[PDB]
Amino acid sequence: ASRILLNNGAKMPILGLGTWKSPPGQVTEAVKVAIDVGYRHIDCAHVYQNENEVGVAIQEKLREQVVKREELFIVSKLWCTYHEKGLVKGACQKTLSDLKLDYLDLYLIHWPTGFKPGKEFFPLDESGNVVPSDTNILDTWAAMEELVDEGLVKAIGISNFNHLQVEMILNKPGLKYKPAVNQIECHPYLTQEKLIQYCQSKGIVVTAYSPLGSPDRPWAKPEDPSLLEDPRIKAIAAKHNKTTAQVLIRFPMQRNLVVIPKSVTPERIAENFKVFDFELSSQDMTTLLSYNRNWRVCALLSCTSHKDYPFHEEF
Numbered sequence: 001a002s003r004i005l006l007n008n009g010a011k012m013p014i015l016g017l018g019t020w021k022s023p024p025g026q027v028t029e030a031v032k033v034a035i036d037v038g039y040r041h042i043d044c045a046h047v048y049q050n051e052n053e054v055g056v057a058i059q060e061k062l063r064e065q066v067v068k069r070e071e072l073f074i075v076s077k078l079w080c081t082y083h084e085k086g087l088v089k090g091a092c093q094k095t096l097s098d099l100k101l102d103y104l105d106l107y108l109i110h111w112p113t114g115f116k117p118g119k120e121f122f123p124l125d126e127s128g129n130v131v132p133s134d135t136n137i138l139d140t141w142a143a144m145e146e147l148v149d150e151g152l153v154k155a156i157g158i159s160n161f162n163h164l165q166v167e168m169i170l171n172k173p174g175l176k177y178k179p180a181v182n183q184i185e186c187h188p189y190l191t192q193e194k195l196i197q198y199c200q201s202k203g204i205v206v207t208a209y210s211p212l213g214s215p216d217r218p219w220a221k222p223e224d225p226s227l228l229e230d231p232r233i234k235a236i237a238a239k240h241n242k243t244t245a246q247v248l249i250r251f252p253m254q255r256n257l258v259v260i261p262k263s264v265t266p267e268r269i270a271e272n273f274k275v276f277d278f279e280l281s282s283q284d285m286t287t288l289l290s291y292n293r294n295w296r297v298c299a300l301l302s303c304t305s306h307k308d309y310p311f312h313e314e315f
């Protein structure tokens with residue numbers, strides 16, 4: 001099935017297009033091509049600095065009547081410098097304005113860590129540590145709930161929250177809306193079994209980011225493990241007459257996850273969508289899971305002293 005039912009009663013496409021690092025002069029075409037070849041879910045964020053250009057593509061495809069707005073599922077994320085109650089609505093509205101939308105399908109707290117507001121996305125002290133905000137995650141959640149009640153967003157969720165932080169939200173006094181989604185890094189080298197089971201047991205849908213291991217991440221080191229080049233994964237793909245990327249995308253789908261591979265290459269955008277016509281066996285799935293090594297693309301390494309840094313915790 002192409003969509004998963006969320007705890008807000010809406011359905012979310014299990015395959016979406018990622019847009020982190022998609023250059024602004026390429027992302028409009030990427031999103032146009034994606035919609036043309038079947039994608040109905042785009043993963044966005046203000047911090048990616050390309051929402052205007054994503055929006056141009058969405059608006060053109062709506063105008064062309066390639067798709068209806070109700071058939072699209074557009075996700076964005078509240079950046080860390082906007083955790084303050086009085087800044088959340090304006091951050092959401094800037095994203096809506098850039099994406100050329102009147103509502104988002106899903107709006108996520110991008111990270112649990114709040115930073116000092118201002119122009120800088122990573123405000124630093126003179127010694128290089130990120131400068132925190134005193135705003136706690138629970139008050140930021142209350143501000144997210146208001147966006148649902150104002151009609152700006154259909155669903156709210158979280159991203160990069162560890163198990164205890166998810167629990168904190170679920171245990172919030174006076175909680176009005178549960179998170180619909182927790183978007184986390186997940187691939188065969190970071191399989192996330194504990195966090196995924198917890199979220200799924202609470203009815204929170206998990207989205208897997210960096211499913212191909214983000215080979216374009218800015219801090220890649222040549223010695224790092226490489227999913228797309230792992231001969232063991234290549235062998236599973238060859239057995240199924242699929243590409244390694246197609247296996248890497250199908251894998252989270254069969255764990256009841258949503259998955260958001262990024263590409264700006266038209267052929268790969270189309271490739272990555274052709275994952276609804278084959279099945280990995282249970283043995284394939286367990287074999288892929290066995291490759292876990294707790295290896296992260298995204299460890300927010302500049303924020304490790306923040307009180308809310310998510311990755312000291314086991315999960």
Ligand SMILES: NC(=O)c1ccc[n+]([C@@H]2O[C@H](COP(=O)([O-])OP(=O)(O)OC[C@H]3O[C@@H](n4cnc5c(N)ncnc54)[C@H](OP(=O)(O)O)[C@@H]3O)[C@@H](O)[C@H]2O)c1
Nearest residue numbers: 018019020209210211212213214216245261262263264265
């Ligand atoms: N919530 C968060 O904190 C967070 C963090 C990280 C990522 N995300 C989201 O998750 C999305 C996906 O993660 P990601 O961008 O880190 O990396 P990814 O999707 O794991 O990998 C993207 C890279 O793989 C390449 N690629 C794509 N399809 C390919 C294929 N079929 N064959 C070979 N190479 C292929 C892309 O190249 P080309 O583009 O050159 O084709 C790009 O270099 C992001 O774009 C963003 O939307 C969210």
Ligand SMILES: Cc1c(S(=O)(=O)c2ccc(=O)[nH]n2)oc2ccc(Cl)cc12
Nearest residue numbers: 020080111113298299300301303309310
């Ligand atoms: C890692 C990391 C990043 S990132 O790598 O810039 C990133 C990448 C992509 C993205 O979508 N979000 N962030 O930002 C953070 C902010 C707070 C914390 Cl605790 C960790 C990080």
